[PDB]
Design a protein around this ligand. Structure first.
Ligand SMILES: COc1ccc(CN(Cc2nc3ccccc3c(=O)[nH]2)C(=O)Nc2ccc(C)cc2)cc1
Ligand SMILES: [Mg+2]
Ligand SMILES: [Zn+2]
Length: 313
């Protein structure tokens, strides 16, 4: 109860900034998450005995893939922490609790393959879940781990609060399906412009939380150039392995996943920043003004990719 987590000075200061990198020491990532839960939520939010056992079961159910791994889980939860801390009064006690856990769990048991590859392969999960295939799997795995003896970090919520938090986590994890992001952001764009956006409207909050999830999930592009550049290698390592597996099924992959088209990566990154990242953090900045540093960092990295193309690196 009187047992805080403390970080070294540099981490204690940098963890509050959006562009924080959690570092290469895996054994510090659980403590960093607990630290973020305590400052975001309270030292009372969760029984430390149960939280620590939940964290270690979640860690175990992430795989050793190049990008969709335990480091990504903690990276995405830190972005959510930074968003929640810079928007103190806009979120209920349940939402702060739910969303850090949703972020930690959002890619549970990822295999390093897209929903598309599962459908072309004809993977059992694609029969069980026809849309948002992996994302419905991630929420399933989350629920399973919550029901292991000693892992129910929500036990002390009331029956109705318990149902509200699981519902927040389900919508939050489904929203990480990038296919659903485009429509969600177009709707939020119209609602903000015509002036009908209303955060006391539950359907509206849902939409806003979904965009927050997309923004935390894409946060690779809001780091300092050397983190962004080195993370892009891990992402392409998964994508090119999936492209290889497509070729094995006798399907030419999209160039994004074809390791023979590495030359086209800089131009492919421009398309991604312009079609996905910039719009995401722009709409997010419009709704939650204090998330502007994410948009600023994203534009900086766009500019760095433009320099790669112009031969300057
Ligand atoms: C931040 O890290 C990242 C690393 C990789 C990626 C992969 N990526 C960029 C990309 N890279 C290529 C590479 C080679 C050849 C061709 C391409 C190509 O056409 N796309 C996308 O997601 N593109 C995209 C997706 C959706 C829309 C709507 C528009 C564009 C994205 C982000
Ligand atoms: Mg995912
Ligand atoms: Zn993710």
């Amino acid at each position: 109860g009187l047992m805080q987590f403390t970080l070294p000075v540099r981490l204690c200061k940098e963890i509050e900034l959006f562009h924080f990198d959690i570092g290469p020491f895996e054994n510090m990532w659980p403590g960093i998450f607990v630290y973020m839960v305590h400052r975001s939520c309270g030292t009372s939010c969760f029984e430390l005995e149960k939280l620590c056992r939940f964290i270690m079961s979640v860690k175990k159910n992430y795989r050793r893939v190049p990008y969709h791994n335990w480091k990504h889980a903690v990276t995405v939860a830190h972005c959510m922490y930074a968003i929640l801390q810079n928007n103190h009064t806009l979120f209920t006690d349940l939402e702060r609790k739910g969303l850090l856990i949703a972020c930690l769990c959002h890619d549970l048991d990822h295999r390093g393959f897209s929903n598309s590859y599962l459908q072309k392969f004809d993977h059992p999960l694609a029969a069980l879940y026809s849309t948002s295939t992996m994302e419905q799997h991630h929420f399933s795995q989350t629920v399973s781990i919550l029901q292991l003896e000693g892992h129910n970090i929500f036990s002390t919520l009331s029956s109705s609060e318990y149902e509200q938090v699981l519902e927040i986590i389900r919508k939050a994890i489904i929203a990480t399906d990038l296919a659903l992001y485009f429509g969600n952001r177009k709707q939020l764009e119209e609602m903000y412009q015509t002036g009908s956006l209303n955060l006391n409207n539950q359907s509206h909050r849902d939409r806003v939380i979904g965009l927050m999830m997309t923004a935390c999930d894409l946060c690779s592009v809001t780091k300092l150039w050397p983190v962004t550049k080195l993370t892009a290698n891990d992402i392409y390592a998964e994508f090119w392995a999936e492209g290889d597996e497509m070729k094995k099924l006798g399907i030419q992959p999209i160039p994004m996943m074809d390791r023979d088209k590495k030359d086209e990566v800089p131009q492919g990154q421009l398309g991604f920043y312009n079609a996905v990242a910039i719009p995401c953090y722009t709409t997010l900045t419009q709704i939650l003004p204090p998330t502007e540093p994410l948009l600023k960092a994203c534009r900086d990295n766009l500019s760095q990719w433009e320099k790669v193309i112009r031969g300057e690196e």
